[PDB]
């Protein structure tokens, strides 16, 4: 059996930190990464996404 | 010899671990946290 959480928050504000400053940046002005997440992703069986 | 053995702990979650998929973090103080390396018996042994 395998399980896998999809729409979990990290609640702390201490969690919520990046391993380096310009990881994945964004033309846009506010990151789409911030807002809380509403899916998970995992490999198939063929490995297919 | 009266002494204890300070284990591999630290103030934050974030910094004991590394974003390699492999051993732990090993930076020191950060800005006001810390990370203590591990100094006792156990450091080949006992698997995180």
Known sequence: TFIMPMGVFQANSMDRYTRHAGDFS???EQDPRQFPPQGI???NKDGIL | FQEAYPP???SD???L???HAGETGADEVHLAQYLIRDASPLRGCLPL
Do not use: D, E, Q
């Open chain 1, 41 to 43: 992703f995992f490999y």
């Open chain 2, 8 to 10: 591999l702990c630290s």
């Open chain 2, 17 to 19: 671990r590394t974003a």
């Open chain 1, 26 to 28: 964004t033309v846009s």
């Open chain 2, 13 to 15: 979650a974030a910094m």
